[PDB]
Ligand binder design. Structure first.
Ligand SMILES: *Cc1c(COP(=O)(O)O)cnc(C)c1O
Ligand SMILES: *Cc1c(COP(=O)(O)O)cnc(C)c1O
Lengths: 401, 401
């Protein structure tokens, strides 16, 4: 034996550690700001009503559990493309796209990474924003690509280093791969404004880079599915043929069901089919075919007018609660007599917020107020409720005064 | 742009090719023996009663859709290890195993392949039986391992080439990897008998090879979960610390839900925690966390005495039907006056049967009898029903007489 004696204990996960440490807390006051999923005003997981409705519909039909095609549920992939691209989008209407179901957003990103490793002969380099979601690194590295970075977040203003971004991108070698977060940047919450986006599109076009969009928060960011996909649609319209990963984890609250899709924009329908054949060859030896549950739910919702309609109301409802918490934290910090500038809290979008707090401060927060978050000053706004926003503002004020 | 112009259309799937021809056919006597899933006596997909019950139970509980841990549902992984190893297994009781949820058997196989590529310093060679399930090749190849083979099937007798298998295995360099089908060999249906298994274990032990078991048909093969896992259990008892992939796709009819597991037998519980850490690190960047539906269903069945009892009756029913079909086919052949030896049909186990028919005979069966199968003479026993076993016997006689 002794096959594994040399296998060492891997590094402990920080996110994991704050939740765990949060749990062993006795403060009734305590708060978990490291939670990566949406929570209602009561701090509870939220299953959408449109989701429960779709499940009752599925149940009623007494559906089989037979394998889906390698590429996934056709009603799902089509609807997914439609949601992303837009109903009257030329890319959509001509059928010059290829969409395959992936295991949520992460599985979709990996499939894409693997596809690029295999067929993107022009380069091995992937440029991630500084910083980006931690998983981005291993996804691409494991796939066999090299990681590079472009300036993005400005720690001085807790906003976008637009100038730094433009300078870096301008210098990226032609035909390199650039990863862009479609909206609700993770982990900062800092997104380019529509006008900066047009400028970014132009440089990307000029450098003839392959733009890879990570779209995990469509609709969940601003409450508007069209506005959330604006940037993506802009690049395509500018004639940039992107690659994209979509997640239904957050926008439909499908977390554990794992529904997502990977899309490639091709020159034509003919090319899309060639590309499609190769994606199938790639997926087979990965997991054979995708999990059916989440795809069935998502497909029902997107394809049934009445459910799609209720869905839009509910996503807006989630986006609104987050926006409300941001607004309330700022007002409450002001009311406390805080002299610092906290406008970044309201300028930021989505679930994550880069507070600008320093590590020793985060520490004071955990130690004396029972407020759990990562040492990078990142807080999950999902963890803030109307009932504790006051408490958090006070604590923050105390530690920063 | 023209990023994908050099992407060639991938080769067509012959199996799919067989199903499409089948579908076109207007002869009401047509048979599809190219089907890779269980079919009832009426030729329909079958969702187990215990599955319907578990589902209803889940709905009733209004469970959330929160992310499962990376390694999967703990209740599912424990129950999965228990099923494979046996309740009173030393490996199990001592907790010297590590089980992680995978995307059905395929995903689990791949996770394992990736784990070997990363940590199995001793060799890059994986020896597969001749022949093996088609997907085995690219699974190991995509993972970065080298493929080798050992003689397994004997076309002379449509049975095991024991002499050849033993000779090949005896020449495998120490510390190489050998893939073994736990039961219901895919695609021949030829499995070693107990005595043969004892000899094989002795050699694997002696040459100190890492045994990788693919267990996709536990309970489905003979209708007895204990008997089906006999060989895997025997290896472990002999002091061979194996690696194993389990699938619930067939035994539970979970197909599309993708419920499976990957297990590593370790020296001790300590070593298992280390290996588990490394498995989590590998999985995150693949798909983050596993699909919940299938696991929930499978856990409920295994962990609920009433449901479990019911499942055993149902899996037995499935296996029984298949054995009955093999039985009926053989007697009907004699009945038609087939002088030939068709004992292999009954000696073979599981879903697949290598008939020994030649390509030209297969063509005649398709062309003249509207009986669809692959040219290797492989038949899916699931496609045979009480209503058509007679016809098949008939057609076989005609083409071999
Ligand atoms: C959540 C998220 C994804 C997708 O997550 P899944 O649960 O795998 O769908 C992808 N990228 C980012 C940046 C995310 O925050
Ligand atoms: C079915 C099967 C598997 C697992 O298939 P999944 O649908 O991915 O669970 C693995 N190996 C063999 C030989 C099989 O026949």
């Amino acid at each position: 034996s002794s096959w594994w004696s040399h296998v060492e204990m891997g590094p402990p996960d920080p996110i994991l550690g704050v939740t765990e440490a949060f749990k062993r807390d006795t403060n009734s006051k305590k708060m978990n700001l490291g939670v990566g999923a949406y929570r209602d005003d009561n701090g509870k997981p939220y299953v959408l009503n449109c989701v429960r409705k779709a499940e009752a519909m599925i149940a009623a039909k007494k559906m089989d559990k037979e394998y889906l095609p390698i590429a996934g549920l056709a009603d799902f992939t089509r609807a997914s493309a439609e949601l992303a691209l837009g109903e009257n989008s030329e890319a959509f209407k001509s059928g010059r796209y290829v969409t395959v179901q992936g295991i949520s957003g992460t599985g979709s990103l990996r499939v894409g990474a693997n596809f690029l490793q295999r067929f993107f002969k022009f380069s091995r380099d992937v440029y991630l924003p500084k910083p980006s979601w931690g998983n981005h690194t291993p996804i691409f590295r494991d796939a066999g690509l090299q990681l590079q970075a472009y300036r993005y977040y400005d720690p001085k203003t807790c906003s976008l280093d637009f100038t730094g971004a433009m300078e870096d991108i301008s210098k990226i070698p032609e035909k390199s791969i650039i990863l862009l977060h479609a909206c609700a940047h993770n982990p900062t919450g800092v997104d380019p404004r529509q006008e900066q986006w047009k400028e970014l599109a132009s440089v990307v076009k000029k450098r003839n880079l392959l733009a890879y969009f990570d779209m995990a928060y469509q609709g969940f960011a601003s409450g508007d599915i069209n506005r959330d996909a604006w940037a993506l649609r802009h690049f395509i319209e500018q004639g940039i043929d992107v690659v994209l990963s979509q997640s239904y984890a957050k926008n439909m609250g499908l977390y554990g069901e794992r529904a997502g899709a990977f899309t490639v924009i091709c020159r034509d329908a003919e090319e899309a089919k060639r590309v499609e054949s190769q994606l199938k060859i790639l997926i087979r030896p990965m997991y054979s075919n995708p999990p059916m549950n989440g795809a069935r739910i998502a497909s029902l919702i997107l394809n049934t007018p009445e459910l799609r309609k209720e869905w839009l109301v509910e996503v807006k409802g989630m986006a609104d609660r987050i926006i409300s918490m941001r607004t309330q934290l700022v007002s409450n910090l002001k009311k406390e007599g805080s002299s610092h500038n906290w406008q970044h809290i309201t300028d930021q979008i989505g679930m994550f917020c880069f507070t600008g707090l320093k590590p020793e401060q985060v520490e004071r927060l955990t130690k004396e107020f029972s407020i759990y978050m990562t040492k990078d000053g990142r807080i999950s706004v999902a963890g803030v409720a109307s009932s504790n926003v006051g408490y958090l503002a006070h604590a923050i004020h105390q530690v920063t005064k």
